[PDB]
Amino acid sequence: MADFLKGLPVYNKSNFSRF
Amino acid sequence: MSYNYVVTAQKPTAVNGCVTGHFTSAEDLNLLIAKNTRLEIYVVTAEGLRPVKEVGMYGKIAVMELFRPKGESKDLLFILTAKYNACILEYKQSGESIDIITRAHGNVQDRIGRPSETGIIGIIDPECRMIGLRLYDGLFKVIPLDRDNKELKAFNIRLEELHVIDVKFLYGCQAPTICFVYQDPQGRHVKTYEVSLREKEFNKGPWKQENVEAEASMVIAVPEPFGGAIIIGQESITYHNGDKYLAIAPPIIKQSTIVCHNRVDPNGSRYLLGDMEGRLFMLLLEKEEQMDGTVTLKDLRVELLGETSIAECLTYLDNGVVFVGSRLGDSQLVKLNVDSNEQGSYVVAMETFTNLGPIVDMCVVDLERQGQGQLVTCSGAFKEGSLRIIRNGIGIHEHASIDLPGIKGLWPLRSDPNRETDDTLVLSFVGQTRVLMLNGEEVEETELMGFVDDQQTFFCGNVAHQQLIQITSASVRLVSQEPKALVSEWKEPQAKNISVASCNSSQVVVAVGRALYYLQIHPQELRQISHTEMEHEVACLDITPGLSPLCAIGLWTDISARILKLPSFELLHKEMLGGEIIPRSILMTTFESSHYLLCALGDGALFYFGLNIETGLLDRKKVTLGTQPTVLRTFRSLSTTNVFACSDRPTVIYSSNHKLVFSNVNLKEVNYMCPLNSDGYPDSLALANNSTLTIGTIDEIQKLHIRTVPLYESPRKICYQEVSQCFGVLSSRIEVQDTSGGTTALRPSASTQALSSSVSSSKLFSSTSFGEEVEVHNLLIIDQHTFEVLHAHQFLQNEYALSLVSCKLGKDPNTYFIVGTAMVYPEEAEPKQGRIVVFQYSDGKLQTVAEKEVKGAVYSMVEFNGKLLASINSTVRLYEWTTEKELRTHYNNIMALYLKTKGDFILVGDLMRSVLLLAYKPMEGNFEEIARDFNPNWMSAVEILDDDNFLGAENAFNLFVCQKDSAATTDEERQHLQEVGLFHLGEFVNVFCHGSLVMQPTQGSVLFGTVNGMIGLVTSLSESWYNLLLDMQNRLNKVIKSVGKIEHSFWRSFHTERKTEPATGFIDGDLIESFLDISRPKMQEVVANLATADDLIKVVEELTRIH
């Protein structure tokens, strides 16, 4: 598991969870 | 006397720039994608990318940056055209509509600069102090940012540093400071300057000038918490900030040059990088929070995340998702995951966007085989190289057919313990009705047994309460799903016939003469509710759920779109749209977040409206489909589905951005239709006409259906060979010198995993570094149905293929694949050795017939008159197919890259620079130079319209037409040809060819493909069409608003570094078809003298059906 991929920027969470 | 016409057949699909910011509102995560002349704006919503407004400018977007200065509501967009048009924009949705106000604008070209290698650079201050430009060498331009500078004013500083690579504004400085990488003798360096917009000078910059890598190509502005600049070279990534300095050199990087970068975190701790090999890295600035609460930066680390497509833009959106803007291939959407689930790739594709990529070559084929052809292009480069098969219009593929003679209705029916799959299809003839019993696909009908026999069924559905109704000319009839017998029937009061029928799951609206009766479906009973006689005679009805507040109607007298409630027949509206022929079909359905009303006149036109359902208030526009009464019907592909327009020009109305799509269907004529999800033809459609009774499926949501054939290598040329029923494609792949002194495969591409896969081994020559990238060219025998690499014939080392021909030669019965190559040694830039090879695809082998040794580069060649016209370096030979199959050879002296042949012994060659005109005579075998062109052009494409019209395109994104001069003395003045046409396209044409995408008053058809994936058509106009639309141009600039206030006059002007002329002999429907998107006051300001709206609105409607 990547170290540098924990905690990517989140401006809104309901922003990309449909697809 | 050359009057032409160019339209866009496909918007540019390549992505050149993409930025993120708050443009619509505050905290509105917008993705702004720059194509070429198009600008796309999106809002990040749960759904994914959803657009708000796709605008269109009169320029090539070269700089696109976002920012909101001191005290602003939302970010202000900034755009710079490659022709030097600057403008600041502002999204303003104050009204229910959308308008991009142009806060400022101004042209900032300098009459005295030279554009620099690495092109234009547009940088903006960290705190919105100024815009900085790097248009020309040695001239850094400054545009201060206040409010009164609405006419964008600017001034130049002077730059002692002459060759400059990349410039950036540094964060966290005492005042504007600039960091850039420039080159001179003794390598290249990084210098620092301070911009002083109070004295218009350069001041000594914050820190020392460092030496950097020789191939430093990018400078990254590092944000406030750290401050500094990151410089990305080929092999070392370095960090510069004053005296502090860090650098790591992973060998993981050198294999491909890093091209793009994107900032992830606001802190700048994480960055995204991109290779030309398609990689995606994560550059890290790891932190070291010290005792005094401060944060510092300790090291750099780069570790690979996986691979996207080759990226020219890069952008993190939200929730671990990155938009990959690809210029050489499909742009896509990407999710980065902490857990590398499969292999080592932390990258997962979510969505891909069709990019026709760099269109290198193409050709037209009748794959559908009526009159409508399909474009087969060579898109993409390197691993994203593919073939694209542009099919125009919604198509079907039939599964069966039955000789029927004149049906008058189609209806699905379900007569069993409900299996959810329709098992019965019911037809109707002018009287007789026959209930087809089809457990399989049977013909024999058993009238499932109460349905009427010879009275001509008007509706046949599956009503609720588990029953089956039939409306006919006798009565409505209810056959049950309990004993399967006739249990209820509504005869007529007067015992007379029914005219109109309208039935849903539980309601029925019928009509007799002028009367309107209402019925409700109940178990084994038919109940009467409402009752009314209309003002006039009923022509068509519609009800739409199993209970409808409204009931639409069409009357026989005044073409009145009238809406009625159903519990009674209270009139809710009538429209002032009285024609003269009857309305035939009417329908109201739900497409997307809306409710439209549709009505079909008997002449062939159709109206659409909008409304809600709590009042009957309703968007007139005379859209014309066919010429015969268009019978409407709703159909079901997925759940959110659309309506079918039965006509002799079958249209389909889909949902666009919640508006209207009108895509023709590739069928001749259809009169009646209904969907079908059958236990024998599932999710099929039943199509009726005057002949057969087809049944098949559907394809697409809009006009084009783009088929893709991934090749994973670079395709260069393409031909089509009908006798073999397969395509011919030349292609090259990349290979790197191994530890053994030979090459290797980068990735398994199509030529290496082909079925046959032969090679060469031809001794025709007799008179070698390590760690390089070499090219390997092949001839691909792609099949035309199951696109696959049947055969892949490989050429010799250092041999590049440059031209492809599929023709017959002389009186030889065979059709051959002729390939002309060029020996390229990575040293001397004009080839001295070449080859023309003639192959034949007999059965499964690729025979080598002949082989004429040639010394020179066979740039292009074309079949001429059974002879093999070829262009070798500076000679244009005319070969001839010997009976011994030897192709013996016949002269000019000129570097021909491109070569076309009208016929009639007349030729077109380009490129020492300009165009030439050569003629062959059965006289000596030699050509005569008829009339050439002398004003130079660095050209890229060529085509013939007729004997006196020659289409050109050059490296400058312009078009132009040549034509033989008719002046006084034919002694010399005829020996020249002038340029009756000049036009600026903004696209880089690579290939011209003839054909049309539509099955087909205006003469001609020539298609062209471009680097940005744009496809366009060229036509010709008589002197009465050209002068009509020309004045229709010079009156539309006044009444159409330019986004950047860029006058259309300037955009189309023939622009180079030398002659900047006005356009002539050209007309763009992209500026004239838009005339159907204005209001009538404006629309009637252009059409007043010299002619009304209804005499242009439906004339242009012919001019959109050319592509």
Residue numbers in the entry:
A (entry chain C): 1 to 19
B (entry chain A): 1 to 545, 551 to 623, 625 to 773, 780 to 901, 905 to 1015, 1023 to 1112, 1124 to 1140
Cite, word for word, the article reporting this structure.
As a structurally distinct sub-family of CRLs, the CRL4 E3 complexes consists of three well-defined basal subunits—a cullin4 (CUL4A or CUL4B) scaffold protein, a RING finger domain catalytic subunit, RBX1, and a large adaptor subunit, DDB1 (DNA damage-binding protein 1). Distinct from the adaptor subunits of other CRLs, DDB1 uses one of its β-propeller domains, BPB, to anchor at the N-terminal region of CUL4A. Its two other β-propeller domains, BPA and BPC, form an interwoven double-propeller fold that is shaped like a half-open clamshell, and provide a binding surface for DCAF substrate receptors. DDA1 was first identified as a subunit of the plant DDD (DDB1–DET1–DDA1) complex, which binds COP10 and together plays a role in repressing photomorphogenesis. Its animal ortholog was also found in mammalian CRL4s and the DDD-E2 complex (DDB1–DET1–DDA1–UbE2E-E2). Despite this increasing body of evidence implicating DDA1 in CRL4 function and regulation, how it interacts with the other CRL4 subunits and potentially contributes to CRL4 E3 activity remained largely unknown.
